[PDB]
Every structure is written in C-alpha cells, then in structure tokens.
Amino acid sequence: GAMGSMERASLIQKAKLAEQAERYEDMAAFMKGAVEKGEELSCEERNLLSVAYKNVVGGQRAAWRVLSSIEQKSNEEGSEEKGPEVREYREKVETELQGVCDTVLGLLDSHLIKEAGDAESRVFYLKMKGDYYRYLAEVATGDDKKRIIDSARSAYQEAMDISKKEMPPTNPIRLGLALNFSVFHYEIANSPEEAISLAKTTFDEAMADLHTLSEDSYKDSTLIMQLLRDNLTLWT
Amino acid sequence: GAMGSMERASLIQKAKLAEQAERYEDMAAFMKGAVEKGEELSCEERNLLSVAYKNVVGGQRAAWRVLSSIEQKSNEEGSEEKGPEVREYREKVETELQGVCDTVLGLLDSHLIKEAGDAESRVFYLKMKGDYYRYLAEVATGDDKKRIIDSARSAYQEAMDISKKEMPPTNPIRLGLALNFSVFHYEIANSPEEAISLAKTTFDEAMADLHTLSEDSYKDSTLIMQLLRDNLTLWT
Amino acid sequence: FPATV
Amino acid sequence: FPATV
Ligand SMILES: *CC(=O)NCCC1CCN(C(=O)C(C)(C)Oc2ccc(Cl)cc2)CC1
Ligand SMILES: *CC(=O)NCCC1CCN(C(=O)C(C)(C)Oc2ccc(Cl)cc2)CC1
Ligand SMILES: [Mg+2]
Ligand SMILES: [Mg+2]
Ligand SMILES: [Mg+2]
Ligand SMILES: [Mg+2]
DSSP states (O other): OTTTTSOHHHHHHHHHHHHHTTOHHHHHHHHHHHHTTOSOOOHHHHHHHHHHHHHHHHHHHHHHHHHHHHHHHHTSTTSOOOOSHHHHHHHHHHHHHHHHHHHHHHHIIIIIHHHOOSHHHHHHHHHHHHHHHHHHHHHOOSTTHHHHHHHHHHHHHHHHHHHHHHSOTTOHHHHHHHHHHHHHHHHTSOOHHHHHHHHHHHHHHHHTTGGGOOHHHHHHHHHHHHHHHHHHHHHO | OTTTTSOHHHHHHHHHHHHHTTOHHHHHHHHHHHHTTOSOOOHHHHHHHHHHHHHHHHHHHHHHHHHHHHHHHHTSTTSOOOOSHHHHHHHHHHHHHHHHHHHHHHHIIIIIHHHOOSHHHHHHHHHHHHHHHHHHHHHOOSTTHHHHHHHHHHHHHHHHHHHHHHSOTTOHHHHHHHHHHHHHHHHTSOOHHHHHHHHHHHHHHHHTTGGGOOHHHHHHHHHHHHHHHHHHHHHO | OOOOO | OOOOO
16 A cells, blocks of 8 residues: 555545546545545545546546457458557556456455445445446456356346435436446346336436425436436437 | 567557557557667657657646646635645656656667757657756756756757758748747747747748648648647737 | 446 | 647
C-alpha cells in the first residue's frame, strides 16, 4: 500500500480532485487507498470508487476491442502475415485489464462485501462484483470461462434478490443493477430473451412507482429508465 | 530499457497499434524504445514519437491547469483553509509532467539532435526541444525559470535559423515551428508583439509560396496557416 | 457498447 | 490553450 501513509480524508479529497482533472488512474489509486483503511464507505465514497474504476477499465475495454478487431482482421487470410505483434499487444492490454478487475474484486472480497449490512451498500458491491466478473468474461477464452460467467451471474442474482426485497423499484441502484444484469444476459450469457424480459419488467415496475418520488429522485430514476429503453430499442 | 529486448520494427508496429487504440502512454514507451535502438528516425517515425509524447504531456498539462486553478481559488481568502491536499496533488502531477519533459529532452540530447544532419530532421528535433522546455517553463516558479525560458528560446531560434535557410516558407515543419515559437513569445516570454509579428510574417510568406504546391502539400500547409490565423484572431 | 452504469 | 502542433 503506497497510500498507506496518507489520511483517509486526504485520499478522498484527492480522489475528488483527480475526478475534476480527469485523472482516473490516480482517482482509482486514491480510492483503493481509502478502501484499504478498513472502514466502511459512505454512499458518496462508493460512487467515487465506482466512477474511478469504471473509467479505468472502460478505457482498457475500448482499447482491447480496437486491438481484437485488428487481430481478427489480420487473421482473415489474404491480409498477409502480420507477425506476433498485434496478438502480443492485445494480450498485454488484456493482462492489464484482468489485473484491474482482480484488484477491484479483491477490494470487494477483502472486505467490502462482508461488512456491507444495509441493502444499498450490499446491492452496490454485489453489482460491482457482477460487473468486474462480466469484464473478465468479455476477454475469457479458456478453461475458466464458464466459471467466470457464473460468478458474474451469481453476484448479480444475489444483488437482485436483495434489491427486490429491500428497495423500491425506482431505486437507482436497483435500476442500474437490472440494466447491467440485462446487458450480461444479452452480451455474455447469449440469452437475449432474458435480457429483454428483465429490462422491460424493470422499466414497467419503475414507471408505476414514479408517482411516489420527489422531482430530484424522479430525475435520477428516469435517467436509468431511459438507458433501459435505449437498450430495448437496440435489441428489438 | 524495458523495451531493450523488443525488435525496433516491432516497437514501431506496436506504437501504430497504440495510436489506433488511443493508448498514448504505451505509444510513447514503444517510441522511446525505438529511439533507444540508436538508429536515426524516419519522417513517419519522428511523427509517431511527437504524437505519442504531445498526447501524454497534453493530458498532464490539462490536469495541472485544472489543479492550479483549484489551488489558486482555494488560496483566495474567504474560501476556508483547504489543507495541503490541493498543493500536494498539483505538485505530484507537476513532477510527473517534468519527468516526461526530461525524458523527451534526454532522447533529443542522447542522441537524436547530434545525429540529425538534414534540415527536416534537425528542425523537427530542435522544435521539439523548444516545446518540452516551454512545457517546463509553464510550471517553473524558482531559480531556474529564466534559464528554462532561454533554453526554449535558444532551441526555437536555432530551428528558425535553419528553417529559413533550408526550407521553403510553406514547409509544414517550418510553419509548425513558427506557430509554436509565436505561442512561446505570447504565453511564456510576455512578448505579445513579437508573437503577433512572427505569426503574421510566417502566414504572409507562406501565402505567397502556395502557388508552388501540389493539392496534397497545399492541404498540409493551409492547415497550419489556419492555426496561425486562429491565434492572431485570438490576440488582436 | 449497450448502456451500462 | 492557443493552437500549437
Ligand atoms: C447510497 C449509495 O450507495 N450511493 C451510491 C450510488 C448512487 C446511485 C445513483 N447515482 C448516480 O449517479 C446515477 C443516477 C447515475 O445512477 C447510478 C446507479 C447505479 C450505479 Cl452503480 C451508478 C450510478 C449516484 C450514486
Ligand atoms: C520529414 C519529417 O520529419 N516529417 C515529420 C513531420 C510531419 C509534418 C507534417 N505533418 C502533419 O501531420 C501536420 C500537417 C499536422 O503538421 C505538423 C507540422 C509540424 C509538426 Cl512538429 C507536427 C505536425 C506530418 C508529420
Ligand atoms: Mg490472455
Ligand atoms: Mg424474472
Ligand atoms: Mg514543483
Ligand atoms: Mg523577425
């Protein structure tokens, strides 16, 4: 822990500065540091952690997809032997992506999830676990691919179970969870019907609970509902 | 040299892949590796080197400016004592920026410039030296500020001297040089009149030589001329 | 890339 | 940021 000597509050403060400067690797490092202090995270702090890592891995995923696209094209015969370079560089980016995923999953396992007793914290962390297994699934090709897929599924399902018992259908975390779990069904599990069904049911259940919300809550909920509708339009 | 074991051609190939994937730190590392093979760079290779580092330092400059802006605001009294965090993080970004500048300047000095015998290569490297001293000048506050400023000036001037003797006034490297040297006068040397004069004279001399150019050369030249006109519009 | 959050 | 290249 290179952040071991810095105050928890200073790490959080610097994470917020890193966000403003769009320094997401720095942000993730500061938030990792904060988690490793061993105290539970607040709502705002969980959001900082998620934003930092989503941006770091988001960059790596975008790069990996570019490199994989080149690798596949260069392996379509008639292209003339590229050499090992595209594969080697795709593998380098892939390994760095897997490292980040393992880091996040490590933080969740040691010991964010086990200490998370409230619905919002537990659902948030379990959603994250599902997400970082999904990212590993996106690049997995070998012996463990199925077990990686099922780890994502298991985390998402546990999050869903808690969210349905403990949260209203408009809760943005519940909505975000269902959004991402739906994408998992479509893109990873090869289950477009399950994806569509989950997104539609989630959208309709939220619609019917919107009347209970303030103007601010309504904005947050309808933001995620729009993303559900966007995906459904993509898929149907 | 962590790239010491990789083939020069493989490093160049990977630099091009990194560019496509927008992995500019990777790109710079691959191009550093290529330079350290000790052979002269081609036109295309010089461009890869410049693009990689311009993007890396460009990100650091953008972040530094965000952090400095926050630091200055938080030092306007009435803001309540921020603590050391903004200063510490600005200093961290500043030190990483200075490291990159020192790396580039090191490559130019060992031994890109001394081997560059043609006008285009020598002017390109001297322009780069001017640029990476300008970036150091942007953040310099202490004993060496004046010497850093004059190092940039000296590199730019030597590049100008060669460009005026050896290159037509439409040569994109000559034009780019004058563009950046003009910015140096405006932003670093506090000499807006010199900046404006240099940009105007450069623009007018190029205008008068455009008739000599092919359609492709014309596109390249007029691209940089537009940037000169943009700055002049900003400044007058 | 479908929408995720 | 004025234009540089
Ligand atoms: C209490 C708690 O854990 N809060 C952190 C999560 C919230 C969720 C809502 N939010 C958002 O920015 C928007 C509205 C975009 O939605 C989500 C929903 C789910 C996730 Cl995982 C991220 C963002 C603020 C942070
Ligand atoms: C022969 C050689 O050294 N070539 C490398 C430099 C060229 C300059 C022209 N170029 C460009 O992309 C544009 C037209 C944008 O202009 C410049 C001009 C100067 C610099 Cl330093 C960069 C880009 C291709 C590369
Ligand atoms: Mg692999
Ligand atoms: Mg169901
Ligand atoms: Mg300093
Ligand atoms: Mg003059």
